[PDB]
């Protein structure tokens, strides 16, 4: 029988907090928006907002806040005043919640279906659970939502394409923002022919309430677990959201960097067994994918069990080819079983992760989007090999951080299966990108033991024969030119790994 794991023992890999740099003092800069008082930041205490009182920016460089005095509705009145009046009502039946949300979303009264919300409230939840939802949870959520201007006093910049910028806010600030997202209060984020925000993911939660899918009740359970936790016991930590956009990449053909360590296994999970490691989110270029709609695979699941990730959709413009989003400090509030149609909320999770010197949990997640390959051979074209190498490299590289202070990358089959990526090519691409960024690799194959063995065997071969990144890249070019370029069938007769073995064994 196959071994459960191969390569370097996982305990020898680097992880946070042990491997981490000594952090300088947290402070605002041109590259770093910080929305809390760093001088009074203390372990186990809710951070204070900075500035002390609300400041509004209503412009194309910042989030358009629901509490803005420029948020107007039909003479021209205050939409925030209307939101307060709508939400400060007793909820006893799901229609009451629908009617509240639609008071300040009149244009969508016909377009937004609330069937899933109604079924969740009336049929899925037991009577006692329903009562708790409308008697405590929903009112408590309204309270933190309407406190937005007192909690989020600082304008939140949009993380636009090409920006290298970080935003660090408190988990409490995120809770208030996400409660607003639940009640669908964010202006200009709803229209299908919207202009300014057409390049941003959805933030308002309206699509969680629609339709008859059995998935919706599980999403609502997972999110209500979160909202219950944060309203009963306010979170005290911070979270950093960092957009990274690289213009320059390794000259892959000539790269002399050696391959790094590999641990590869067909058991375990990125979030469970990659604790303290750089955890890859197999992203959509709109970060979070269909979390607030119909999607429920790797990304969306992560965005539901660590829901502070969802707030990134408020201010993160769609990723370009050379970009990623890095999120440090999100907390796990839920446990789940299954996947996609079998996904179920299992129970609450009590996150026991340590926090760094900026009070961020030692959980780092990077959203990198693979290309979708609707024609299989396209991914072996050198330009597309380089696109994926560069995307992964952007996700892994940390400018100005010594290699010894970098955790292993915890990843797996990125953009494979129905997205069209070849697992064996994609594994080698990530290994090369990690090598270029001088990080080790922990690779989860999710039940595919043959794939685990093949990845380990290839890494071992390449490592023992001392082929550096450039040598392996040149072998990929050889495969393209010799077996793919002139291939009249959907796939070549000889596979990549066999081709590499024979290429090297027939060489000098």
Q: How many beta carbons lie within 10 A of that of residue 352, not counting itself?
A: 8
**How far apart, in whole angstroms, are the C-alpha atoms of residue 434 and residue 392?**
8
203 known member of a binding site = no
Q: Which two tokens stand for residue 405?
A: 């202070």
Element at 392 (helix H, strand E) = helix 382-396
Residue 296: which residues within 8 A CB-CB, separation 6 or more?
215, 218, 219, 290, 339, 340, 341, 343
**How far apart, in whole angstroms, are the C-alpha atoms of residue 505 and residue 500?**
8
11 known member of a binding site = no
Residue 293: which residues within 8 A CB-CB, separation 6 or more?
202, 207, 208
- Measured in angstroms, the resolution is 1.9
DSSP 346: E
Contact 353, 275 (CB under 8 A): yes
**How far apart, in whole angstroms, are the C-alpha atoms of residue 92 and residue 133?**
9
Q: What is the largest CA-CA distance in the chain?
A: 82
226 known member of a binding site = no
Pairing of strands 77-78, 72-73: antiparallel
DSSP 294: T
Active site residues: 281, 299-300
Contact 171, 310 (CB under 8 A): no
**Quick check: helix, strand or coil at residue 19?**
coil
**Quick check: helix, strand or coil at residue 338?**
coil
* Peptide bond connecting 17 to the previous residue in cis, omega within 30 degrees of 0: yes
**How far apart, in whole angstroms, are the C-alpha atoms of residue 278 and residue 473?**
24
**What pairs with residue 36 in β-bridges?**
49
- Residue with tokens 């406190």, as numbered in its chain: 147
**How far apart, in whole angstroms, are the C-alpha atoms of residue 205 and residue 186?**
10
Contact 368, 394 (CB under 8 A): yes
Report in angstroms the alpha-carbon separations of 122 from 127, 138, 214.
Answer: 8, 15, 14
415 known member of a binding site = yes
**How far apart, in whole angstroms, are the C-alpha atoms of residue 301 and residue 279?**
14
**How far apart, in whole angstroms, are the C-alpha atoms of residue 110 and residue 105?**
10
Q: Which two tokens stand for residue 45?
A: 């205490």
Q: Which two tokens stand for residue 145?
A: 């939502």
Half-sphere exposure of 318 (CA within 13 A, CB side): 12
284 known member of a binding site = yes
270 known member of a binding site = yes
**Quick check: helix, strand or coil at residue 336?**
strand
Task: Tell whether the torsion through CA atoms of 294, 295, 296 and 299 is positive or negative.
Answer: negative
Task: Count the helix, strand and coil residues of the chain and give each as a percent rounded to the nearest 5.
Answer: 40, 15, 45
Report in angstroms the alpha-carbon separations of 115 from 121, 184, 462, 474.
Answer: 10, 16, 55, 55
Contact 302, 364 (CB under 8 A): no
**How far apart, in whole angstroms, are the C-alpha atoms of residue 164 and residue 176?**
26
417 known member of a binding site = yes
- Residue 316: exposure state from Cβ atoms within 10 A (0-12, 13-18, ≥19): buried
Q: Where are the domains of the chain?
A: 1-508
Report in angstroms the alpha-carbon separations of 491 from 106, 351, 483.
Answer: 52, 45, 9
- Residue 262: exposure state from Cβ atoms within 10 A (0-12, 13-18, ≥19): buried
470 known member of a binding site = no
Q: How many beta carbons lie within 10 A of that of residue 124, not counting itself?
A: 16
**What pairs with residue 367 in β-bridges?**
281, 325
Residue 135: which residues within 8 A CB-CB, separation 6 or more?
none
| 223 closest CA partner among 133, 105, 91 | 133
**How far apart, in whole angstroms, are the C-alpha atoms of residue 406 and residue 404?**
6
**How far apart, in whole angstroms, are the C-alpha atoms of residue 380 and residue 382?**
6
| 83 closest CA partner among 145, 19, 16 | 145
| 319 closest CA partner among 382, 387, 383, 375 | 387
Q: Which two tokens stand for residue 88?
A: 């400060």
| 262 closest CA partner among 107, 427, 96 | 427
Alpha helices in 170-322, H assignment, sequence order: 171-182, 215-232, 270-273, 298-305, 312-315
**Quick check: helix, strand or coil at residue 143?**
helix
**How far apart, in whole angstroms, are the C-alpha atoms of residue 208 and residue 161?**
28
200 known member of a binding site = no
Q: How many beta carbons lie within 10 A of that of residue 383, not counting itself?
A: 8
Half-sphere exposure of 194 (CA within 13 A, CB side): 13
């Amino acid at each position: 029988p196959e071994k459960k794991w191969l390569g370097t023992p996982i305990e020898e890999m680097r992880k946070m907090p042990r491997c981490g740099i000594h952090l300088p003092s947290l402070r605002p800069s041109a590259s770093h928006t910080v929305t809390v008082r760093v001088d009074l930041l203390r372990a186990g205490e809710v951070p204070k907002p900075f500035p002390t009182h609300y400041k509004d920016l209503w412009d194309n460089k910042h989030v358009k806040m629901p509490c803005s005095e420029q948020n107007l509705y039909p003479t021209a009145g205050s939409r925030w005043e209307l939101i307060q009046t709508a939400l400060l009502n007793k909820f006893t039946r799901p229609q009451n919640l629908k009617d509240a949300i639609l008071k300040y979303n009149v244009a969508y009264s016909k377009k937004w279906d609330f069937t899933a919300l109604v079924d969740f409230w009336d049929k899925v939840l037991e009577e006692a659970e329903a009562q708790h939802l409308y008697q405590s949870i929903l009112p408590d959520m309204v309270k933190i939502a309407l406190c937005l201007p007192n909690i989020c006093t600082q304008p939140i910049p949009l993380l636009k394409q090409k920006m290298n910028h970080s935003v660090t806010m408190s988990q409490e600030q995120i809770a208030s923002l996400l409660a607003n997202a639940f009640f669908c209060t964010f202006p200009r984020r709803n229209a299908k022919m919207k202009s300014e925000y057409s390049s941003y993911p959805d933030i308002n939660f309206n699509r969680l309430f629609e339709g008859r899918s059995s998935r919706k009740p599980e999403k609502l359970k997972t999110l209500f677990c979160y909202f219950r936790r944060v309203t009963e016991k306010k979170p005290t930590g911070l979270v950093t959201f960092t957009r990274q956009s690289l213009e320059d990449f390794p000259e892959w053909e000539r790269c002399e960097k050696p391959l790094t360590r590999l641990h590869v296994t067909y058991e375990g999970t990125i979030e469970g067994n990659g604790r303290g490691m750089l955890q890859v989110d197999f992203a959509n270029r709109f970060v979070g994918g269909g979390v607030t709609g119909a999607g429920l695979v790797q990304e969306e699941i992560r965005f539901l069990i660590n829901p502070e990730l969802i707030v990134s959709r408020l201010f993160t413009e769609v990723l370009d080819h050379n970009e990623c989003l890095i999120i440090t400090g999100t907390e796990q509030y839920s446990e789940y079983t299954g996947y996609a149609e079998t996904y179920r909320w299992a129970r609450s999770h009590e996150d026991g992760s340590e926090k760094d010197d900026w009070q961020r949990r030692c959980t780092e997640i990077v959203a990198i989007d693979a290309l979708h390959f609707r024609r299989y051979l396209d991914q072996f074209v050198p330009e597309k090999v380089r696109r994926e190498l560069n995307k992964a490299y952007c996700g892994f590289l940390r400018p100005g951080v010594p290699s010894e202070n970098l955790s292993a990358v915890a990843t797996g089959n990125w953009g494979c299966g129905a997205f069209g990526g070849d697992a064996r090519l994609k594994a080698l691409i990530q290994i090369l990108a990690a090598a270029a960024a001088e990080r080790d690799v922990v690779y989860f194959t999710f039940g595919d033991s043959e794939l685990m063995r093949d990845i380990y065997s290839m890494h071992t071969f390449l490592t023992e024969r001392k082929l550096d990144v450039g040598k392996v890249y040149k072998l990929l070019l050889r495969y393209y030119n010799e077996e793919c370029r002139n291939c009249s069938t959907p796939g070549p007769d000889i596979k990549l790994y066999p081709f590499i073995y024979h290429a090297v064994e027939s060489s000098a």
